[PDB]
């Protein structure tokens, strides 16, 4: 709805920065609404959904197992690793690593998983081989959150991320069990509360993954809809703002409120 575009424009005014927006129909894949759909924005932690998308693809191929234990040392720990720092001696399975990466946005869990699939270059090759020819991952955590202006590294386009997310969740790329496993992780997301979930009515379904980085970078990708069933993909990115995190989260939440109102 056009009214939602008014809020996105209002958001850019409030934040004094760019805001990429795209509303996609999960079913047909038809683009419902868009704003700066083909401009690049830092992916940040939202790439973790794609990372586990690739990990699950390998699980399906038999090249990887969900229960395989991965051991790491203190040398591997990077900033913001709430789950991995508590299991240095115990280690963690591939299933736990993806849960920690998506649900908790654990940075080290992303790096450990990144090495098992071949790193950034392989994740990009995976996305390319599935139709996404623009989304690219170059660095590791936490460097991929730099958000240097005009830097095309570790970025995506709202439209690319939206369609790529749709293919992973509803396409035939992953097995039914893996597609379902991916969404379960996204639904259990416990760090995106201040965003779209706050503007969500009771009974609605929400599977998401937030992103935060330097230079006011903030974003979120989601699959939501009424009656406990997802029916639409929403992708919101913004970078360049000097606004605080609460002000940034408030604007994104307002976009989500408008999105709901004119559903």
Swiss-Prot record:
Belongs to the class-A beta-lactamase family. The beta-lactamase present on pBR322 was cloned from plasmid R1 (R7268). The class A beta-lactamase family has a specific amino-acid numbering system, sometimes called Ambler or ABL numbering and often misspelt as Amber. A multiple sequence alignment was used to derive a consensus sequence and then the consensus was numbered taking into account insertions and deletions. This allows use of identical numbers, e.g. for active site residues, despite differences in protein length. UniProt always uses natural numbering of residues, hence there appear to be differences in numbering between this entry and some papers. GO terms for biological process: beta-lactam antibiotic catabolic process; response to antibiotic. Changing residue 213 to S: In TEM-3, TEM-4 and TEM-8. Its EC number is 3.5.2.6. This is Beta-lactamase TEM. The active site is at residues 45, 143. It holds the Pfam family Beta-lactamase2. Disulfide bonds join 52-98. It comes from the Bacteria. Gene3D superfamilies: DD-peptidase/beta-lactamase superfamily (3.40.710.10).
């Amino acid at each position: 709805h056009p009214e939602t575009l008014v809020k996105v424009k209002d958001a850019e005014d409030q934040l004094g920065a760019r805001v990429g927006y795209i509303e996609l129909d999960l079913n047909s894949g038809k683009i419902l609404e868009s704003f700066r759909p083909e401009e690049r924005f830092p992916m940040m932690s939202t790439f973790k959904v794609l990372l586990c998308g690739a990990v699950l693809s390998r699980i399906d191929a038999g090249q990887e197992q969900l229960g395989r234990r991965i051991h790491y040392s203190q040398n591997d720990l990077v900033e913001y690793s709430p789950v991995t720092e508590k299991h240095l001696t115990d280690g963690m399975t591939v299933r736990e690593l993806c849960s920690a990466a998506i649900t908790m946005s654990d940075n080290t869990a992303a790096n450990l998983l990144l090495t098992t699939i071949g790193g950034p270059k392989e994740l990009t090759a995976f996305l390319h081989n599935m139709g996404d020819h623009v989304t690219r991952l170059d660095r590791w955590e936490p460097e991929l959150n730099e958000a240097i202006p005009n830097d095309e590294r570790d970025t995506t386009m709202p439209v690319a991320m939206a369609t790529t997310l749709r293919k992973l969740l509803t396409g035939e790329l992953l097995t039914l069990a893996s597609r379902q496993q991916l969404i379960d992780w996204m639904e259990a997301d416990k760090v995106a509360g201040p965003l779209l979930r706050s503007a969500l009515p009771a009974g609605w379904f929400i599977a998401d993954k937030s992103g935060a980085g330097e230079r006011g970078s903030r974003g979120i990708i989601a699959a939501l809809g009424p009656d406990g069933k997802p029916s639409r993909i929403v992708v919101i990115y913004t970078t360049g703002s000097q606004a605080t995190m609460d002000e940034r989260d408030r604007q994104i939440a307002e976009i989500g409120a408008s999105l709901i109102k004119h559903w």
